[PDB]
Amino acid sequence: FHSFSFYELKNVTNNFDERPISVGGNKMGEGGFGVVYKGYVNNTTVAVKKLAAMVDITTEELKQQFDQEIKVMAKCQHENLVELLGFSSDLCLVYVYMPNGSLLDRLSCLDGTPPLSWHMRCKIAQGAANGINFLHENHHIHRNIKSANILLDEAFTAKISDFGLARASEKFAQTVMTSRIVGTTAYMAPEALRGEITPKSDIYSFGVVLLEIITGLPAVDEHREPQLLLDIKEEIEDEEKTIEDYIDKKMNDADSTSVEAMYSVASQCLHEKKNKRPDIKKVQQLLQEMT
Template sequence: MEENSSRYKKAFRRFEGSIQMGKSPTCELLFDWGTTNCTVDDLVELLKRNEFLAAAALLLPDSVKDSDNAAKWTSKNTIPIHEIHMASDCPAENLEVPCSISDSRSENSSQDSETGFCRFSFEELNKSTNNFDDRPVSAGGRKVGEGGFGVVYKGTVNSRTVAVKKLTTLVDISIQELKDQFDQEIKTMAKCRHENLVELIGFSSDHDDHCLVYVYMPNGSLLDRLTCLDSTPPLSWIKRCNIALGSAHGINFLHENNHTHRDIKSANILLNENFVPKISDFGLARACGQLKNTVMTERIVGTTAYMAPEALRGEITIKSDIFSFGVVLLEIITGLSALDETREPQLLIDIKEEIEDEEKTIEDYVDENIGREYSTTIEKMFLLASRCLHQLKNKRPVINKVQQDLEKIVTILSV
């Protein structure tokens, strides 16, 4: 029995690892399936038993046509993504337009009546970024970084430094999907304003390349600082804990107001001049009613090395944000990236299993830039990360509890 359990765990890790590396887990699954003398009928029955009816119907269309389980295509706990009522966004009370918006408005921009954000012309943003100079800022250019949905440039508007994100199809998505993400980010940022959420100043939509304009974050991302990009000094343990706590505050605000971010990662936690963390990149964020139901989507989005098991199956739930934040906590402790194909284990989340199996200890993975005198609080953060990374979503703590535990850690460090 234990042998079978071990085999299955290794198989699942292999399948998930294929996804993280951008490879097809299907090939790995079929190879494994072919070694067990199973048939297509066996696979279909297994899919039906676990209510993956769409997959079963794809393999054998007649297998679910008259099934008693057909009603479960849309269960009472599942809402099709196109039926979500989006009116339950973050409350608008006390959400005045930040003074920084008016400060950043130039003679070529105007205030959008629906959102209150500045509406810039593409020509103005093009000029402010030196024609979207693709050379890195460190090399005298304007490029700050890039992600799956766009490139971020450093610009100047009305004598103020800003970050301009030019949306570009760097991944396999349509132009329409990219525009949908543009609209979603503006909608979310218009409704949700908080000290630990990045501040959107305005946007440009008068050109094929849509742009979003944010307050510039001079200390880059948490990922940049953990990897000491451009030879910056390593973050102290106390500073890391405060960044973790501030990030939890931001996520808690989203969850309290019925939003799930869906792409929490260290690259999306930006740091201002005082290292105050700001959650960014809301193109994938969703308002999900009271978030008591599981929402399904056909398109799997996010960054796979941070994605919870249910997110890889297409579920949208706030519990997936908790899992992703657990990966971030491991990054904070270890200074290691979430995925490194040259490392063993390649996935950072796998160190949790190694430690739980007593193959290694957390001390084996602690960032060498952190002093050993912090072992007590490091252990507490690792235990918190482990709870966040539970395979079963309902076993993970709510973000409010995560926030409370981080507050206790910060309190210990401040004594």
Template sequence: MDKSLTSATYIRNISYRLRRQLSDFLDPQDTWKEVIVSIRKRNGEPRYSQHHVRRFEGLVAQGRSPTVELLNDWGTSNSTVGELVDILKSNKLLAAADLLLPNTTVEEVTSPETLQISSAETHSALPTRLLEERELPPPPPPPPVSCNLQPQIPQEDTEPGHTGELELTSFLYSELKRITGDFDDRSTSNGGSRLGEGGFGTVYKGFLDNRPVAVKKLNPMDDMPMDTLQVQFYQEIQTLTVLKHENLVDMVGFSTDEQQLCLVYAFMANGSVLDRLACLEGSPPLSWQQRCLIAEGAARGLEYLHCNHHIHRDVKSANILLDENLVAKISDFGLTRASANQTSTTMMTERVVGTCAYMAPEALRGEITPKSDVFSFGVVLLEILSGLPPSDENREPQFLMDVRYDIDDEDEALTLEDFMDKKMRGWHLSHATNIYSLACNCLHDRKNRRPVMKQVLSEIRGVVKSVSLESDV
């Protein structure tokens, strides 16, 4: 039992560890079905139909827990632990109920009258979509032994990072308004708070106890209704609660009150790689050594994600942020998926997501695989080499990923040396050739011909070591 749990705790705030313990009670003999048929909407109608039940049954063949997935889905509403315990006890599932709230009688949790009132008052204004209408965010994986490395003991070929539940702060929306100057839409350079556009929302700068933070206010769009946005909101929280690494952005907390979804992160003083390569707001060009270190850091972050069986699905230079020391941090995890069975297998989805200029051929077909992240990272490497944006309507070819065909074509005049960023100093053609060859390998049309992120990281490290040795001479 989590001592912080009360009958008023939202189901979505039940830890993954406790969800797995509940699944030990409810998965055998399909006991979870007794729970799902008891879950009701505000009007008293069943929340889930037999069609939904069959969909949950299908998860078993994928090695996934129907109980965990049910709690993930039900948790997108404002349903509480008290409501869940009432259902468990009404179905004589006392051991499971006691796991959540030991020694609590049904009357102590919620009376029928209280349940009716609380259900009407706290029902989310962000409704839960039916299961067949959207993807369920998968549960985070248990920490694999081989990847659960200790940050305080740096070793050769190991990555600092760990998995495990982290405590995040739940902010009042009014507090976030206060620290961002009421979400002042003027840019920070003009005295406002607006830092720019992030994934599915606008990012503002604020201060918590004199510490700068970035507040992302999520906004529904024509192609992103509020309920879908809510799923991605909780997916990002879920991912960054479970996974922690030097090269992943640090989440401070979140806010869900007043029907507003906000995420709070540590402030990244140097913005995104996309903006720094463009020398936005007069920032100086990145040197070759800085770019190599940024590439290495981003590769480390992605390798850590893949090592922990997560696929980012939207790798791009705009989602690689830089702190005050130009340390690369992967951000925007709203589209992230955990691999089925905690393996690096391919999954399928009917909803194709991502950014077109970075998308692998299989991603356009709805395949979800770590090799798609590798492909997208190949585009990022080309950006680092050239300083060019990933897409430009006035450029031929429009997509940067296609420029490699001109470089590799002996009948074309474009060479790698011509392709390199003219603003960059300190680069050597031999090192640049290594990174370019790696990028081309990452961009192979056939995913099985691409390297895995561990190989990508190893090759970049080799270049970084060579560059460091030469700079010391």
């Protein structure tokens, strides 16, 4: 990886211009642990993520995720993984530019982009599953699978991002002692919330992403019934509603059999008991057969 000086990263991002792209600024996105800026360097467009405490998190904790991202990215290069180009040590990571942003942005139709077709959503789901299969074959657990961590290039190819929490070893990691767990709780499996590290947790989180794809709704919304998206599984199983009641209205090309087929996959991924979920290879097979 290339070691960029901090000052030249400041230059190429128009002095880290935090105005949106619309008004001629460089801000592309924001999360709990940083802001992502569009940059121009070496006759190319790049993305620069500058780490910062936007939510409650310490400097030492951010430095750990910075070092972990670089260690994992050095071992993991794949069609369905975002490519790290370099770094600078504030702490900056530099990536290949993804012009179609995150899956979350595109499902919300941010900045008046047109809705994703059913067929495009199926191909993105397949791409993301192939990304997770690479990681699991190479004995990695992502630990932060969500629509904001699925990026889209010129061809709408799915690229998994954010490897700051990724681990190379399985753990039970539960005692009567107080502990600190990091993650996005709206996407997290029961055993993941309690602190267990297993690839079976990545399957559950993928299940939540499949529901976002079907419904076009965010994983959590305070001003909604239900607030958690994964709760609709019970609503449908109790025959109180159907999947048809939750399908994204903005889709016109979603045949019932194909949508029913994807919900069944999502339902299996969202089993409370981790041993009762399909493995990633079974998820790949099922997605391929219905598309």
